[PDB]
Amino acid sequence: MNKVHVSAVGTSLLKNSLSADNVKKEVEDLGLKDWDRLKFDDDRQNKIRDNFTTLKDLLLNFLKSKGKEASAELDSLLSAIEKLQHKKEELYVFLYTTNTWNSKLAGEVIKNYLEEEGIKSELATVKSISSEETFHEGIEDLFDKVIYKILKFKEEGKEVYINATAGLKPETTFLTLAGLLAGADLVYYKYQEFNDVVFLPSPPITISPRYLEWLIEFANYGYTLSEKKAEELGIPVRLLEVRNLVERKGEDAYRLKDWVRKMLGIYLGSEF
Amino acid sequence: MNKVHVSAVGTSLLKNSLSADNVKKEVEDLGLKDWDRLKFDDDRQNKIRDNFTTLKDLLLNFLKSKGKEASAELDSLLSAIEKLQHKKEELYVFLYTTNTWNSKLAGEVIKNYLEEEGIKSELATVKSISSEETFHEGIEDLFDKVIYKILKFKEEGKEVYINATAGLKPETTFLTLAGLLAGADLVYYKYQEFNDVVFLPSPPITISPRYLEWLIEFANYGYTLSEKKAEELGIPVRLLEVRNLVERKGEDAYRLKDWVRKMLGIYLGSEFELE
Secondary structure, three states: OOEEEEEEOOOHHHHHHOOOHHHHHHHHHHOOOOOOOOOOOOOOHHHHHHOHHHHHHHHHHHHHHHOHHHOHHHHHHHHHHHHHOOOHHHEEEEEEEEOOHHHHHHHHHHHHHHHHOOOEEEEEEEOOOOOHHHHHHHHHHHHHHHHHHHHHHHHOOOEEEEEOOOOOHHHHHHHHHHHHHOOOOEEEEEEHHHOEEEEEOOOOEEEOHHHHHHHHHHHHOOOEEEHHHHHHOOOOHHHHHHOOOEEOOOOOEEEEOHHHHHHHHHOOOOOO | OOEEEEEEOOOHHHHHHOOOHHHHHHHHHHOOOOOOOOOOOOOOHHHHHHOHHHHHHHHHHHHHHHOHHHOHHHHHHHHHHHHHOOOHHHEEEEEEEEOOHHHHHHHHHHHHHHHHOOOEEEEEEEOOOOOHHHHHHHHHHHHHHHHHHHHHHHHOOOEEEEEOOOOOHHHHHHHHHHHHHOOOOEEEEEOOOOOOEEEEOOOOEEEOHHHHHHHHHHHHOOOEEEHHHHHHHOOOHHHHHHOOOEEEOOOOEEEEOHHHHHHHHHHHOOOHHHO
8 A cells, every 4th residue: 555645534424414314314313413513522522422333324324325425535535546546455545533523423434435445544533623722732733643644654655645625724734734844745636616636736845944954953952042042053033933933932032833843853853 | 015915815705795684685686696606707797897886885885884704804814914913004915816707806895995994905816717727727827926926025025924714725725835935934824713813834945955956957958858868867757757747748758747837936037938
């Protein structure tokens, strides 16, 4: 399985499944009417947890009946595998989703469906982003659970394709940037609007060398610098601050931002 | 105006404006019920064109009544300006949108609103993407009208902030990547359900040195290379083909793909092919 497709999982399957009578009745009876938009800590998440196996079977049968188009993930994945001429034996699909019951439900069903079509896959889960405060931990978790994995598949010699169709814009833009810095080969997207897969312009990128050097410098001195030290090292902290790379935590001090630390520790080395 | 915000313009304003009964009536009477979803060549585009002044005033007053939240563009822009503490005197907002009447209508209204708030701004138009064929020309046009503009603002010593809130996912992902390659300073995003904008991790990026060198090499040899020649230059054409950077032309040759040449214009200058 030298060809990895990476895809977020959203809840489009949950929403589209409501067009089957048996699914609608079941969801209605369990009190799960807006199950595609539950918040992470809505109590109705527990109804999904409590009924997980039965809901999984129910969605799998719907999906078998109605075909790939019920899930934006399966639609784009199978179209792109078709366009790229990837054979089943050579494919591994890496899905990720928030660690919430409604998303895990859709992800597990997609994973099962791919497996019955003879495609190996896995489902990673990541922290919910539900606020500005949780945005940051969410990004760190995407590095840890997704970007790092991309990096490792590249070291194994695999080709990595990023399916940018599913997922909220800010998580997909992160996946695209950090995924390409991790060495992914190609980003693709399926428009519903004209039922075709396109390749987004996705050149191999790296961190600007001058900036990489300034960043590693911070890492050498703990993760903070005085302004005097920055100046002496010829580091324009003003510019790093504008680019959101450092923060002014100090009296005359600059600290490297957490996401930047996580990113260095993920990419160029795994030390301090 | 040393602080530039770049934003796409979509038709969320058109959709949300139908919440006001006076707007709904007016639009309904003109037969413009689905005006937020018109295709580029729908005949109803002309009704928008023909009633432009009227519709513009109507949306501008709706916005005046009901506030910024009716446009995802205005909501995210003004939230970000506020969190960033950018002063009116130092701001310039660069909007872009498809060259269609419904989108130009939203863009013009947004532009006017910003100008009444004392923020100078501009609206560029780009080609519609309506098919696989037009996807590629669409991308080239975004390079020409937007990415190259980012490059120019950077050369003038301005700061560039990319508002990733509005726009279709595929085009904003391109804008974010190529925008950063062009030197943009920060990308930001307003989640609908939050009141605050977030800053997307926007590390300074360049095209990999290794790949820049290989790609420029194609340009020295008339943009095509045989495998034999590529190998002698140490250029792994099968890997470039997987990365969609080259296409196989005939039995034994590889041509640098057109999109890559646009992107090389970031480093070589937009017109480099003419010298």
